[PDB]
Amino acid sequence: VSGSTLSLTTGTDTLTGTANNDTFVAGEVAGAATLTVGDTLSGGAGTDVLNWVQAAAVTALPTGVTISGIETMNVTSGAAITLNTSSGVTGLTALNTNTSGAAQTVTAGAGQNLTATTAAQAANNVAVDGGANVTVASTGVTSGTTTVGANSAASGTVSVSVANSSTTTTGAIAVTGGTAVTVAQTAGNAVNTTLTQADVTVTGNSSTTAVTVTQTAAATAGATVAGRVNGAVTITDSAAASATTAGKIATVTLGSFGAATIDSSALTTVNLSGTGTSLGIGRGALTATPTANTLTLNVNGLTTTGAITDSEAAADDGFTTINIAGSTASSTIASLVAADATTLNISGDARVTITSHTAAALTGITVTNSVGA
Amino acid sequence: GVSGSTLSLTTGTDTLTGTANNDTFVAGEVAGAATLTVGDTLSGGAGTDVLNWVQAAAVTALPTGVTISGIETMNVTSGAAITLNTSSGVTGLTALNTNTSGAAQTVTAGAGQNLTATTAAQAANNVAVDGGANVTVASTGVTSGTTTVGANSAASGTVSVSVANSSTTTT
Ligand SMILES: [Sr+2]
Ligand SMILES: [Sr+2]
Ligand SMILES: [Sr+2]
Ligand SMILES: [Sr+2]
Ligand SMILES: [Sr+2]
Ligand SMILES: [Sr+2]
Ligand SMILES: [Sr+2]
Ligand SMILES: [Sr+2]
Ligand SMILES: [Sr+2]
Ligand SMILES: [Sr+2]
Ligand SMILES: [Sr+2]
Incomplete structure (x- = not known):
């Protein structure tokens, strides 16, 4: 039931809403x-x-402001927004901050879903911290950076969208912490121009089980074609350096990527699509010998120009079984490097092509893929 | 107790009288x-x-010429420092609560007034309280700033001091 509209003043207001839906x-x-x-x-x-x-x-x-019982807080400024709602604000479940052509530096309380929407971000930087679920929705970005959780991680999931239609390389994107992270980039530059997309760094915390990083597919610029280069991707489990602490990031998804690396003792599944340059996979630095040594590469329309490498196997305990499942659209991996792999299984319903492989310890390759390998 | 009215002061000269009920x-x-x-x-x-x-x-x-009476609790919050002595006047006041962030507090309460001085991000600013009935100091983000209770007039009741420091600067 519709409630009342309650206008604040330039004085100190004490406003209590109705039992209804108030604004x-x-x-x-x-x-x-x-x-x-x-x-x-x-x-x-x-x-x-x-x-x-x-x-x-x-x-x-402002000093002495207290907000209680208000479920949504929308903040729109004609310039920048710098705001910390982690104190004085009880009962807020959605915080939405909105700028255009100006920076955002927002810290939300751990129970507040944060949505930071920036139009025409250009060279301005966006930094968000805290919050429950955190969402960054950025368009018209150029050199400006995007940083989530550098001071306090999201309690829930993280979703970043950064769109760039310039030829200016997209400012770096960094996320630290969250139960699951998705960083989605798009390039919208005109034909006969080339845009390099942002480097992405995702550092998990104790709760990060999955990371997804997608970009616009790479292409060479021509009269009919907009050129795009993919940014690098660095994904690090919080326990990657420890000898004893178990990892948490179990699944990584890359949709087009430049030179990409993953480091997580808990990693079992990697989903790959689009245009990739290279992917190096590390499994942390645990001293104990691992028992689960199966890596699943779910590929869908993937084309890599360089190698997918088990970087752990050469001097440590890499994967002994590699399962490649091709789906929806044919894939071509330029090079597969796996020094500890003894079984290669290729399944799925779309062609899987491995142009070259370096896996001297292999004793068996079995293909169940209905289209072929 | 039954709730009363909310009485907002103005930038002019106010003469405000509450209701027989609980007013703010x-x-x-x-x-x-x-x-x-x-x-x-x-x-x-x-x-x-x-x-x-x-x-x-x-x-x-x-401020000059101000008269306050019949009000049992006074909450004082500033964006800068607080220096305030309520040990005379403010007839009927039994609780004084003073709140700063990143700024000093120098507060003297009457011997019958429970004093609570709350300071966030105290850092290098000093907190000094005197007088009061029961006295409570609740300070967070302290660094080199000092905490002094009763150097000029002791609490009539108990004293409770909590000081939190998250720096490497000696408290
Ligand atoms: Sr106001
Ligand atoms: Sr209401
Ligand atoms: Sr309420
Ligand atoms: Sr409500
Ligand atoms: Sr390692
Ligand atoms: Sr090891
Ligand atoms: Sr090995
Ligand atoms: Sr006045
Ligand atoms: Sr009254
Ligand atoms: Sr009176
Ligand atoms: Sr009274």
Whole structure:
């Protein structure tokens, strides 16, 4: 049931909503902000919203402001947003911060889903921390960077979308922590131009079980063709350097990639698609000899120009069984390097081509792929 | 207790009298200007009444000519330092709560007033409290800043000090 609209003032407000769905409006009055020192907002029962909008940059939650009972907080500025809602804000489950052509530096409470939406980001940087589920939705990015969890990891999942239609190389994307991470890049430069996409670094924490990093497929620029180069990808389990602590990242998905590396003692499955350069797979640095030594490569329309390498096998304990499952569209791996592999199984319903392989310890290759290998 | 009214002070000279019930006096800011101002007169009346004094500017004293009576609890929050002595005047006050972040506190409470000084990110700023009935100091983010209770007048009741430091700078 529709409730009331409650406009804040340039003074200290004490506003309590109804038992219904209310909208708290923290706009401007003649250019002056109305979310101001000492404001106390209580949504009451129902699904309540606070819309905080002002032309001037948002620089902080003001002194003495308390917000309770409001389920959604929308923050829109005509300039940058710098905001920490990890204190004074009870009951918020959705925090949405919105800029265009300006930076965002946002820290949310661990129970607040954060969505940072930036248009025309260009050379401005976006940094978000805290939150439950964290979502970054960035368009018109050029050299500006995208950083999640450098100070405090998301309690839930992380989803980053960065779009660049310039020829200026996309600023680096870094994510630290989260239960599952997806970094999705797109390149939208015009034909007969080339754009290099952002390097991506994803460092898991104790909760990170899966990481996904996708980009626009690489291509050579021509009169009819927009050129694209894929960025590097670095994915590191939090326990990658430990001799005793078990890993957590079990699945990695790459949709087109430059020079990519994975390091996780828990890794069992890698899903690959698009245009890849190279992929090196490390399994951490545990001293104990591993018992699960099966690697599954699920490929779908994958083309690599370089090698997929088990980097652990040469001097440590690599994978002994490699399962390659081809799906939906044919794949071509330029080189497969696996110094400890003794069994290679190739399955699926789409062709798998391995142009060259270096795996001297192999004793058996068996193909069940219905299309062929 | 039964809830009463909310009484917002203004940037003009206020004369505010509460209801026989539990009232909340709000002494905030209007567009950056304090609303607790010279000559203000506050009278809580019967019931359990509270004054919330919040402003970005430092608190250095009660403004000239201000009279406060019948208000049992006073909360003081500043964006800068707090320097305040409530051991005379403010008749009927039994609880004083002072709150800063990254700024010093120098507070003297009356011998019948429970004092709670809460400082976040105290760092190198010093906290000094005197007087009071039961005295509570709750400080986080302390570094080299000191904590001094009762150097000029001892608490009439108990003293409870909590000091948290997450730096490598000796507390
Ligand atoms: Sr206000
Ligand atoms: Sr409501
Ligand atoms: Sr409420
Ligand atoms: Sr509500
Ligand atoms: Sr290793
Ligand atoms: Sr080892
Ligand atoms: Sr080996
Ligand atoms: Sr006044
Ligand atoms: Sr009263
Ligand atoms: Sr009273
Ligand atoms: Sr009175």
